Symmetry: D2
Subunit: 396 residues, 4 copies
């Protein structure tokens, strides 16, 4: 990756993460994305939105969003109609794959300024009626939940990803109690970061105009929901009796978007821009679809090798918490101590808007590195279907 032209992150921003049918459920996925894009660009001293040439934006459940979600995000943010816009779907990894593709587009010389990230409005995912065109002459018929179908169910086995999380708990020996105490810890980290103002810089608050008083949404909705007694007492969510995965120790369904602004070396110098970070390398990997939970154990070493960095040099990791067991298993397989992982909490406590989470964890990682005075960060995120994506950054 060294022999490849440099790619700088000059800013990042994210919406608050809203709960399912909660604080941001009135906004569409492109409205969330536009908000994150516009906020990220407003931070770059010396760069105009009209300088952005190309947009890659993740989005998984695109049904009823309309033509090209990424284009709607770009135009809604005030970018020029000349902007090249592509929507990316690598399930839960879409937001990070989008940033990788944006970096590659600078590296091959086809752009000098790129916005990448992702968005998801799980609240506004529709239901589907699949057989109306040819008809169904007789019988009860099904209305398909688009979240379940296109977001949460492995296509091969037709099983929800929570069931494959159980397979992870069984394979790697994590109990209900280990997953619950992880969840409590990541909720406590998210609450502590919230209360300390450590998300204030990365979050762009959302103003909802009154139809009625206006409402400003400022903080992530989920972290405050921790109730330790209830979390430890709730029934398993996917396997009765012997199940270890619960709604409290899994990621919720959520709404949100996140964006980063990328520039080439030449553009950085031309406009005298202050870089936040440098992309050092990345890696995608995949294995058996039902073992998607531990695909980050392949992608992270691959990204570190691409970046020319040893695992021990990393100051902070973001390992996306699709489930508590996913963070536990990948820490075990890679030998990464928890005190280097999700230092401000993870998706179990913060929320998991699936198309945006890969970019959300990168935004949060940059805030962790600044707050903890770190230099090298690595973000890794698994995705339904067996994949994972990982990226290494250097704070400047």
């Amino acid at each position: 990756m060294s022999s490849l032209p440099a790619v700088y992150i000059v800013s990042s921003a994210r919406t608050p993460v809203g709960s399912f049918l909660g604080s941001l459920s009135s906004l569409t996925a492109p409205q969330l994305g536009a908000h994150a894009i516009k906020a990220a660009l407003a931070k770059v001293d010396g760069l105009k939105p009209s300088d952005v040439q190309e947009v890659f934006f993740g989005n998984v459940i695109s049904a009823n969003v309309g033509q090209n979600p990424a284009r709607q995000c770009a135009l809604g943010a005030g970018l020029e109609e000349s902007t090249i816009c592509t929507t990316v779907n690598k399930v839960c990894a879409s937001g990070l794959k989008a940033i990788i593709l944006g970096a590659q587009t600078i590296m091959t010389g086809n752009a000098d300024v790129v916005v990448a990230g992702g968005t998801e409005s799980m609240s506004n995912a529709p239901h589907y009626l699949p057989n109306l065109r040819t008809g169904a002459k007789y019988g009860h018929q099904s209305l398909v939940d688009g979240i379940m179908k296109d977001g949460l169910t492995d296509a091969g086995k037709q099983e929800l990803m929570g069931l494959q999380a159980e397979e992870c708990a069984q394979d790697h020996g994590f109990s209900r109690e280990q997953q619950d105490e992880y969840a409590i810890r990541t909720y406590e980290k998210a609450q502590a970061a919230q209360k300390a103002g450590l998300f204030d810089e990365e979050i762009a608050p959302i103003q909802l105009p009154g139809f009625k008083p206006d409402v400003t949404v400022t903080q992530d909705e989920e972290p405050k929901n921790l109730n330790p007694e209830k979390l430890r007492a709730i029934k398993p969510a996917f396997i009765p009796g012997s199940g270890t995965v619960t709604a409290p120790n899994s990621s919720p369904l959520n709404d949100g978007a996140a964006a980063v602004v990328l520039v080439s070396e030449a553009k950085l110098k031309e406009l005298n821009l202050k870089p936040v970070a440098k992309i050092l390398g990345w890696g995608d990997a995949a294995q058996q679809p039902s073992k998607f939970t531990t695909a980050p154990a392949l992608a992270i070493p691959k990204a570190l090798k691409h970046a020319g960095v040893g695992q021990d040099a990393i100051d902070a990791f973001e390992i996306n918490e699709a489930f508590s067991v996913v963070a536990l298993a990948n820490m075990k397989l890679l030998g990464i101590p928890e005190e280097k992982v999700n230092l401000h909490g993870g998706a179990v406590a913060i929320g998991h808007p699936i198309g945006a989470s890969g970019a959300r964890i990168l935004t949060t990682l940059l805030g962790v590195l600044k707050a903890k005075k770190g230099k090298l960060g690595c973000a890794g995120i698994c995705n339904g279907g067996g994949g994972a994506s990982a990226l290494v950054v250097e704070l400047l």
Copy 2:
């Protein structure tokens, strides 16, 4: 471009293009895409499917297709579970942008063998019920047609693409008659190519489990030309004064197409025979309702990226979203129809939107061989205001 690693096409393949609710409507988009991927890889002497490292696959109307359509295409084609898979949506340009991204992934050194292309099953696009979660307390509600919503409607104007086609006819001065004579010509070219066997090589026929088994070997739309009915039919989007009709627009269709890309190093390592070299590409965009003439920007950009002059191109594929789209881009660019869509275009062949960008590249490679040409350029506009274009050299 030239100072970056070279990218070679070592094969390509496509399904027949089926009509809406027609010959392929029993297959899902991943089944079509897997078929095209498997068929393209079977053509490469000395390359195994297990050598494919990464897949980029276009798909626009992904509702109810399930998690990551590209990953389903890849696994359905027999690729390894280690394969990196990403689904791409740039509406009508998705299949060509997928190939571009695949080329870039080789150029940055992250893959040496990449499958790219696209798939669409418009037949199996569902309807949406959008307000079941929060409810709707009182009043008639709508079931949204997913084709209209996510494929064919400009988001800003909330107008179907046929009305943007009328803007194109008004802006660049093409009458109903000019559009109709263009459409008849492209149907004639597609039928001539069909009968002469010129699609035999690129098409991988589909066997349908049987009643006995059905084999689908031909594109469904070309035979439907009736020049008398075409000249007499009422306009489809503007009553009375309209110029765009269903016969002179692309249909709704099902199909998939795939290409196999390899690096120079890997070509040498496996002693592979390349079909073509990617010379360059370009994306461009402008006002969304003017997407119809975005190729007049993307094509010059691709040629410049390729270091190739427009006059040196031996054949162009200009995707026929509507007849007026080809007419307007030929006018703006100064490209004679004698070099355009030499085996017919999407008005006659069909337009499965997530696949069409790779579909036209597969057809172009056949045109360059059949017409003894060397340099080809494919350009395709897309809803939202964009276009993508690519330049290849037949080897």
Copy 3:
């Protein structure tokens, strides 16, 4: 007794052809079929005008999406005065015959002199239901309910299809798959023979469908579909392997309507009308919902008692063939030979538009009594939920 009450005369009856499910009459709504039968019945009374009709009782079971008061739509569509009293009646399969009883009673209490009664059903245009759109369903696949299954064919109590209760009936009274199959063939042959001789020509009012010339539906659509080896070889419909009830030996889903004109003795002479028949009595009965199949074995003796007529005096019976086993069980239970039952065929061969069939079999009964030179007739029809209705007529 009945003699202390005014007499009620049938001066007319008519019926549409019975169409197959999504078949010949599928483009017509229930009120259009109903209007057709009412207008045809009234056109047959010399000395009576449509404006003389004062009140209408009309059966209809699956009224969803038919609009306000189906009976009122049938009346206004038939050309009846807007002063006409209109009530829609739902007693499931017996609705069409209960409407006739309620019409007779309205004369007998002296509130009307000219009454049209009958029933209609377009099972082809029964919609599907979305039951929880108002409050919402936050997450999960949902159901589109088939209105035929829900409001027509499923016993509300056990949530069982009536076919499975026909299977329960076969197990109760000992009727084999062969015995039900050979009855179905016999009633199919009777319906075809009656069709062949033109014995349905008087009672059926052909339907003209616009579109330049006009298509005309003259025959019932189901009788021609008999295929005796297909019928004996088909797999059972409700219990794989061991079931005796099949689709060929059950009634189909159908569209049709039927109406009769009732007058008081005063108006019969005041207008000098020629009566076709006299209503001598009726009987409603009900038992266990899953045993509705043998409810006519209670309603039929009750209607004979009400009329003061003996079962041996009856020249012809119409026992509605919801399933072939219904006719077999009721014949066995009542000691009625088949040689006096459904002489022109029954619903297994003719069709079962559920809201109309109670009136349809009375229309056919009057035709059987004319053709076979009989005087006393009895019509009995079971309905889902446990009930049955029966009526005794004397041909004049």
Copy 4:
């Protein structure tokens, strides 16, 4: 003909749309009301009931024969004859007329009649799934609008027939607003003074996931009156010039009501104490969109059939489909409002359409009891152009 006696009546509280009773189906509300009426008649066993007529308008998704489900849910014998009746808003009263007729012709001695409606649980319809719809957005029909509230020939909501009623007889936005306010405080006066407690059978809703048990004892609507908010709200069906609003119209509601009827012989045989005697009834109909005025025909017809003059009635219940309906019919019959809906009407109490015909009779007997009257008349208009009226004598 044999006399028909009312031996008891009962009604559920009237729940608001998607409100306090929304968790109950129409047969559950109906079962509740039948059971409560039957528990009031000592000397009469629930197994003595031979026949049920029950009104219900929007029967979609209620299941087979709603009245049969009401009857069995109340504990009546499986031997009971059960028939569901739909004369739209008049179904509850027409059911009672049919029940009285069944006694008068000597086919039954104990009949339960009334009506039920759960407008909260009325579904939406998808009408073209069987034959299908190949391309285009489609409609989900609101079953309340289609089968309850829209006139068949005009395809206009009842609120627009109500505006017709205003212009036809000259009642302003103010006049209807003052009536609505008057019937609201007439209804609120009855709650606090307890004049509904006899007729209402409260409903128990037990929560047992740890949740607290809930009892519904009051009608939900009367407490909602805000006269400041009411006078200043915008019109509901005609902007600017309209006179009909949500506050001055009836709401959408859930509820049920039932009466027990006995023959002359059975009253003496079992030594039952009668609440009232049914004196007569009348049905009438005119132009569909002029249904608001049909009570002006049914009421005189019921009075004439009972052999009683209009001046002798101690209390009228004229169903307030809209405040303008009560105002109009009082104008044409010449009835003073001091003898109309003395405990309030449907604008303030609620209007579950299949039940109101029986609900207003139940309230009528409570008015005659509390006002020490002898002759009461209830009339009710229904969509389609009809109306029904009944005359009773308290005993």
